[PDB]
């Protein structure tokens with residue numbers, strides 16, 4: 001519920017890897033299809049994420065995701081810490097719904113992220129995250 005908390009996991013589809021980041025308090029989502037489930041990709045993703053949102057802490061359902069020196073170096077540089085304390089199903093649901101409209105899985109993934117973030121439920125996840133962060137600054 002704290003505005004700086006994110007959750008990061010990889011899920012699989014069509015023999016590819018989808019990295020999914022969830023802003024816990026809002027439900028807001030960012031995702032990329034990555035070539036390999038490696039620390040290098042995770043580190044690079046964290047750097048991008050941190051330059052865009054105020055990322056303070058990151059949770060995951062697989063702690064071994066964060067063991068690589070590349071990941072530790074990214075968290076160090078960006079000032080992130082990890083912690084031990086379903087979007088994957090919902091995302092895969094939406095992906096299946098728009099899948100036939102794109103050739104590439106990565107395209108379908110971004111269409112799914114779009115739909116999820118804008119969907120009204122009375123505000124959208126996209127609206128919630130900006131309100132939460134903005135309120136937290138002032």
Ligand SMILES: Cc1ccc(-c2c(C)c3c(c(C)c2[C@H](OC(C)(C)C)C(=O)O)N(S(C)(=O)=O)Cc2cccc(F)c2-3)c(O)c1
Pocket residue numbers: 039040041043044069070071073074077
């Ligand atoms: C902020 C920051 C800077 C560099 C690295 C790093 C880092 C830290 C490394 C790296 C690279 C290439 C980077 C960084 O690339 C990414 C994709 C991992 C981010 C780079 O372009 O220099 N490479 S490695 C292991 O071959 O991938 C060389 C290295 C060797 C041993 C440990 C290690 F963490 C690194 C890092 O993980 C985080």
